[PDB]
Amino acid sequence: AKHLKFIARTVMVQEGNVESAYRTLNRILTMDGLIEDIKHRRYYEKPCRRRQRESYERCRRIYNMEMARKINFLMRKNRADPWQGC
Amino acid sequence: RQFSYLIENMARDCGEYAHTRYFRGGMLTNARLLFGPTVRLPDLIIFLHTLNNIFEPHVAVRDAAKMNIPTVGI
Amino acid sequence: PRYELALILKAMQRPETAATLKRTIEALMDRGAIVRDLENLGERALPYRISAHSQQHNRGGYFLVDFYAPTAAVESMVEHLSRDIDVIRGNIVKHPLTQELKECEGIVPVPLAEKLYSTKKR
Amino acid sequence: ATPSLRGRLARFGNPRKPVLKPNKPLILANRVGERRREKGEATCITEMSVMMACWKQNEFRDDACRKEIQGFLDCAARAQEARKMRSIQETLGESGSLLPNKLNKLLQRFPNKPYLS
Amino acid sequence: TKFSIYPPIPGEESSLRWAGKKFEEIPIAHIKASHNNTQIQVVSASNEPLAFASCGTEGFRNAKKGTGIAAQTAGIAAAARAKQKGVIHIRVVVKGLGPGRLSAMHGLIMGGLEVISITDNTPIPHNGCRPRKARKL
RNA sequence: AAACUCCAGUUGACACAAAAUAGACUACGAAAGUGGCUUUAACAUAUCUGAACACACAAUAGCUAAGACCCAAACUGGGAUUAGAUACCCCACUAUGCUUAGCCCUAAACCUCAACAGUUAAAUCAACAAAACUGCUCGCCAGAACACUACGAGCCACAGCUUAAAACUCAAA
Ligand SMILES: CN[C@@H]1[C@H](O[C@H]2[C@H](O[C@H]3[C@H](O)[C@@H](O)[C@H](NC(=N)N)[C@@H](O)[C@@H]3NC(=N)N)O[C@@H](C)[C@]2(O)C=O)O[C@@H](CO)[C@H](O)[C@H]1O
Numbered sequence: 001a002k003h004l005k006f007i008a009r010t011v012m013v014q015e016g017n018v019e020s021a022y023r024t025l026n027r028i029l030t031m032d033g034l035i036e037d038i039k040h041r042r043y044y045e046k047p048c049r050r051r052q053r054e055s056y057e058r059c060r061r062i063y064n065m066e067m068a069r070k071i072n073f074l075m076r077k078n079r080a081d082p083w084q085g086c
Numbered sequence: 087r088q089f090s091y092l093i094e095n096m097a098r099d100c101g102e103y104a105h106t107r108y109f110r111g112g113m114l115t116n117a118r119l120l121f122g123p124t125v126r127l128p129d130l131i132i133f134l135h136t137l138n139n140i141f142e143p144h145v146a147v148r149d150a151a152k153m154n155i156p157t158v159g160i
Numbered sequence: 161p162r163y164e165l166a167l168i169l170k171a172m173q174r175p176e177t178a179a180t181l182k183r184t185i186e187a188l189m190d191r192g193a194i195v196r197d198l199e200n201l202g203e204r205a206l207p208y209r210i211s212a213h214s215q216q217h218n219r220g221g222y223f224l225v226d227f228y229a230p231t232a233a234v235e236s237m238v239e240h241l242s243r244d245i246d247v248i249r250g251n252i253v254k255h256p257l258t259q260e261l262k263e264c265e266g267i268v269p270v271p272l273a274e275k276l277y278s279t280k281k282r
Numbered sequence: 283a284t285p286s287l288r289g290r291l292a293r294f295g296n297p298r299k300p301v302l303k304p305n306k307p308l309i310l311a312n313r314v315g316e317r318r319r320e321k322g323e324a325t326c327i328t329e330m331s332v333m334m335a336c337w338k339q340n341e342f343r344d345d346a347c348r349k350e351i352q353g354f355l356d357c358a359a360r361a362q363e364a365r366k367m368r369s370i371q372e373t374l375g376e377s378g379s380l381l382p383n384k385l386n387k388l389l390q391r392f393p394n395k396p397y398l399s
Numbered sequence: 400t401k402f403s404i405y406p407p408i409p410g411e412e413s414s415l416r417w418a419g420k421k422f423e424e425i426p427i428a429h430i431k432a433s434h435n436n437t438q439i440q441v442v443s444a445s446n447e448p449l450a451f452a453s454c455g456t457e458g459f460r461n462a463k464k465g466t467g468i469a470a471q472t473a474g475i476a477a478a479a480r481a482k483q484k485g486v487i488h489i490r491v492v493v494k495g496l497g498p499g500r501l502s503a504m505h506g507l508i509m510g511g512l513e514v515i516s517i518t519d520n521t522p523i524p525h526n527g528c529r530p531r532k533a534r535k536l
Numbered sequence: 537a538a539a540c541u542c543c544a545g546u547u548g549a550c551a552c553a554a555a556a557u558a559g560a561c562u563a564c565g566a567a568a569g570u571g572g573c574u575u576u577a578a579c580a581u582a583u584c585u586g587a588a589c590a591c592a593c594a595a596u597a598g599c600u601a602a603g604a605c606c607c608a609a610a611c612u613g614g615g616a617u618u619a620g621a622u623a624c625c626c627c628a629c630u631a632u633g634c635u636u637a638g639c640c641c642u643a644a645a646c647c648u649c650a651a652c653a654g655u656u657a658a659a660u661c662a663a664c665a666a667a668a669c670u671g672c673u674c675g676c677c678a679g680a681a682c683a684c685u686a687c688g689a690g691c692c693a694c695a696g697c698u699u700a701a702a703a704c705u706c707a708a709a
Pocket residue numbers: 706708
């Protein structure tokens with residue numbers, strides 16, 4: 001209201017390619033979290049439910065990071081069998 | 087697997103037996119059925135690699151102790 | 161203690177801005193302050209529109225007043241800045257130079273948590 | 283940087299209140315989840331909207347909207363081929379991440395050991 | 400020069416012109432993409448209403464207004480009323496995560512209008528008012 | 537569907553309400569609890585332990601009195617669904633949530649894992665969960681149900697809270 005307009009959340013269109021501008025803008029709002037914040041703000045999320053979701057999201061990250069860290073560590077061993085026949 | 091060929095040849099060279107392949111459960115604790123009643127089990131097992139491919143002790147280490155066979159291991 | 165008065169004055173001329181600073185610095189001395197310096201951060205555009213004393217401001221002058229005063233003079237001076245019509249917004253905070261910065265040796269790596277679950281074959 | 287786990291779970295040495303209350307033990311499994319099915323993107327919708335808008339003006343006559351129909355027709359042919367190409371190629375072709383069936387053969391060769399032996 | 404995605408600040412002088420008009424002068428297309436409707440209103444730089452269209456004003460009822468075809472129809476109806484007043488280039492200011500958030504932008508292009516920017520002004524509070532209680536449906 | 541139509545959209549002005557991101561942090565406090573900014577005061581103890589009742593605190597809800605009111609919202613009213621619908625879905629609105637002053641004194645107040653000190657050896661260890669133990673002290677508990685009851689006492693509590701039995705009954709829980 002009191003800030004300057006057409007600076008925040010604004011993307012310019014290159015050669016009339018609106019599709020790319022909308023995809024970029026939607027990638028700015030998803031990376032920042034606005035998209036998910038607006039979806040949880042439609043209906044009030046009680047503190048207890050909001051704390052149960054943060055824990056679920058934090059334990060999912062921890063697991064997904066380690067599983068990915070092991071997949072990148074063992075991808076070196078996805079090569080052909082060198083001792084074929086033994 | 088890297089040394090499977092080498093060990094098998096030496097066993098043949100020294101007139102002895104080798105098993106560098108997948109250990110079928112029961113070779114030792116069930117030899118009568120698999121081979122026969124009059125089969126003679128090994129008197130000495132030499133483990134050049136005490137671990138399997140999943141970095142766990144070879145089953146023969148415990149299966150040789152059940153059959154009171156002395157084991158040598160690296 | 162030593163405080164810092166972040167003062168945002170209304171965009172006016174030199175004669176009126178100097179009369180306001182003097183009127184403001186004399187109010188501190190009357191409350192027992194020992195003014196130390198008067199820095200000017202220059203006149204710029206405000207980040208957002210500020211509404212004060214039935215006026216919508218878009219520009220203002222930024223002035224810092226470093227001073228020493230007793231603890232009881234801060235609350236009495238905050239009521240003096242709320243009545244001044246030439247003072248858009250003014251806040252008093254403890255000077256950041258009276259807060260020694262602890263030396264840092266660097267980032268300490270944290271090893272993954274161990275012995276969190278029993279070593280049993282589930 | 284994986285988030286820390288010091289003083290998070292309720293234990294005996296930890297004096298403070300728990301930060302996390304996991305319903306499943308935080309121990310890596312020896313397998314990954316199967317990739318979900320994608321909802322998909324409807325194709326030839328813009329060609330399908332300008333072809334049904336011409337019928338209303340021309341009272342559903344196929345002699346005045348011939349050009350519009352071809353756009354909707356040619357698109358359907360191209361879209362149909364892409365669906366056939368995409369399904370077969372993705373599984374057979376190796377691009378980016380591996381598939382669960384091939385990735386679980388790699389995690390079962392290096393199983394997680396939360397026990398002692 | 401190159402091409403930046405950040406809008407040209409009014410104060411600092413730039414060279415980006417559209418039909419001889421500065422970015423500030425370009426008219427604005429305020430889209431409010433709700434869940435059950437999509438209202439579109441085109442305004443000038445001096446906040447002068449030029450055209451207004453919505454799914455309801457185009458003859459849709461109840462649950463047909465919350466579709467992507469009704470928003471596109473509303474864009475064509477607002478891009479045909481503003482093109483008679485001399486509007487070609489617009490600044491899109493979308494508000495809401497409704498179905499007709501992007502479909503109305505296509506409808507404005509199917510009326511002869513060229514979109515030069517996409518602005519998002521979706522209301523996000525920094526905790527303010529409390530929403531209605533969650534539902535079991 | 538009802539409802540609303542001094543309605544809706546842009547712009548501008550405008551809170552005794554509530555405090556995105558940061559926070560992938562893991563801190564403060566006895567716990568309850570605490571996550572917008574600034575300032576003032578300020579966070580017990582140089583052995584440990586130590587109370588249903590002493591002393592002092594204690595989420596939400598609720599009472600009494602006076603204010604405030606954006607939104608939400610038990611009750612209630614309307615609309616619909618349904619065999620019915622005192623419900624789930626939609627709308628509207630109230631007590632209430634907020635402030636001040638008193639009261640009430642409860643919780644799955646549960647990290648269901650007491651306070652202090654210590655160990656990682658030995659028989660590791662019913663099971664599961666959050667590995668198993670030692671010393672010391674306080675508190676509590678001895679089949680299920682009756683029973684977060686009855687009586688008694690106490691309490692600003694008068695459909696209340698705390699403390700809290702037995703008889704009948706079963707051979708299991
Ligand atoms: C090993 N005995 C089990 C046990 O049987 C019990 C069972 O005992 C029942 C009592 O008669 C009855 O008054 C009693 N009724 C009550 N209102 N208290 C039953 O609860 C009780 N059953 C039970 N505790 N499981 O019925 C009795 C006749 C029984 O056979 C005596 O031995 O309980 C039965 C299930 O009720 C099981 O089927 C039996 O296998």
